[model samples]
Target: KTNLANEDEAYEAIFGGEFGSLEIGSYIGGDEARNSKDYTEHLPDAVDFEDEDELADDGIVPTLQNIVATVTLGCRLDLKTVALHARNAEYNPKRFAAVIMRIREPKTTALIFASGKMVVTGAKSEDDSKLASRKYARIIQKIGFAAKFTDFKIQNIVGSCDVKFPIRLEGLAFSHGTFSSYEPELFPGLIYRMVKPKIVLLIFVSGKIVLTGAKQREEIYQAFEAIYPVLSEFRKM
Candidate 1:
């Protein structure tokens, strides 16, 4: 009965082992009742979130334009040696105190640091994410660093899509006054801070949709599904 283990594997994977949850509500909201406000009054009518049809029945298709992923490469690295031996590698201490290198396959830049940690900054696809991650891993392990590919999970997913119609910014902004912001002169798009998924969406009048600050692909799908109905109501006259 090894039930008295060091840590929960699922819990470790979820929070990435003991850095403590950094969710904004954890630090700012606290146990305060003030954080929870009654918004049922003017907020948009609730739709069935659990229905599979909600995700499948939408005309909007989510495309992940960018993804963020990171992992610990198991051992420290020598920047100079990494640059010299690795393929197409370069390190400029004056510009940044990290080694910048790339592999040709997926075309990615892995930031190699002295702390035995390297990470992919932004990748267009998860294929690039994991592929480039392991590619760098192979480079290091092959270069005598004894690298191990572990805990390579997506940190963030940025998705985009097109609605194929123009939206009425003024009405959409005023309707969801608190949750959305729009200033035609300053910014061409309406910035909507979605509550449930905690995603930020830039709704442009041109019907170009961009969703950021999402963890999983479902969140992007769900967020877009939620907004499509709202945008449909405010379609250009």
Candidate 2:
């Protein structure tokens, strides 16, 4: 319900326990002196009935921002011809060996490699990323290369959020030194690595957060929910 001061506090808050001592009335329906099993029996299924309103009240709502995906075309490509004939394509062997092509529909960029591999970036959705990758393959097919689209896969999904309040990085870093890194001189944001969902977060003093290294959007939500209460602890007064 609030930002916990330490790891023990955070754990007990989420897992159920009194802040200190065995104060029976510290929790809801706790006045009845129920044990842990009794309280858990009445708890709702969080996976099915998780509350978004709680996150809204905490001034945090993470949204999918960008997607990075890749695909294998299964045929070698001529980068020079692709750059010369394709629209919105650029290739410079001196600068880069791959053919860079951009599509405006899904607003994504593709790196067409000579080894029959392609990397797509800047897609907002998984479906759009796949569609854009297919379009790139089609473009290559039109240029006399038998590019067969195969092994299209989403490599990463990035999400962002705004907590709408300043965060005390020093305090957070001190409390979570094991899984966090914060060096203001080199970078302004704190790097937090959550192990459960394996999502990495960039938390800034301005309350802006970026979540990366997620394969699915649900992982973002789960990671955010896991850290929201912890982030609240370092809220600047």
Candidate 3:
């Protein structure tokens, strides 16, 4: 006896659309559709640029590579049990001291420790970061653990982009010395620590820049715009 007959069901019935889009699919779709959505909106809150128009295409907008958010499960965990029950989880004290778990839906990884703390990574956006953590918590809860989602905080946001014009790294360090350090003898990337948003930028001579040490999505955009003009000046002709 086979059960059947719902082929003509409403599109919203099984496909509630609430459970519609998967983060993984959208994330992959991001790279291919980088036409209009890039640098869509936002500006420095300062009113000095009141007359200045919105961010023009001349400006640089970094791509968020990874977001690291942490959460506390509110209860201790047993690693052995997690390794056995969780579908896509692994535990190996010899290599790492945490129960590393991964999920494909959000394409994120979670580090579960016995002390009730977990760190989620590889989220493209802040919203995805939080959502990924919540899902991890749910997984823990389903594993028969008292996983109370708490202390959910964004630890870091890493963004990267190419300025497209070669930068004279040696000159940038001397002029921007107050807020930057470039030990080309030791490291190739010049570290520019912005004061306003307190984010760090890794400036390379090849025109590639990496922005780190941000808590919110707004901070990344704010810091990038603020330093773009400086980057333009340091452009190696």
lDDT of model 3 at position 28: 20
State the lDDT of candidate 1 residue by residue for 11-99, as single tens digits.
23322422222111111111223546411121133221111111101056979876656667777777666655543455554334555
**Residue 131 miss distance in model 3 (angstroms):** 1.7
lDDT of candidate 3 over 1-237, digit per residue (tens):
211112112111211222121121221211113555322122233122112222211166789988877788889887767766654665554334466677765778777777778877788988777777887887777668888878889877888889899999888899988998888888898989899998888889999988877888788899999989898999888
Which TM-score value belongs to model 2?
A: 0.74
Top model number, TM-score: 2
- Tens-place lDDT per residue, model 2, 147-211, is 88788887778889998989999999999999999889998989898899988899999989988
C-alpha-based local distance difference test score of model 2? 0.68
Task: List the candidates' TM-scores in order.
Answer: 0.70, 0.74, 0.72
Q: Per-model C-alpha lDDT, please? A: 0.64, 0.68, 0.68
Give the C-alpha miss distance for residue 74 in model 1, angstroms: 1.7
Model 2 ranges off by over 4 Å? 1-59
Q: What is candidate 2's CA lDDT for residue 229?
A: 88
| Candidate 1 minimal-lDDT segment of 10 residues | 49-58
Q: How accurate locally is residue 149 in candidate 2, as Cα lDDT from 0 to 100?
A: 79
Pairs of colliding residues, candidate 3: none
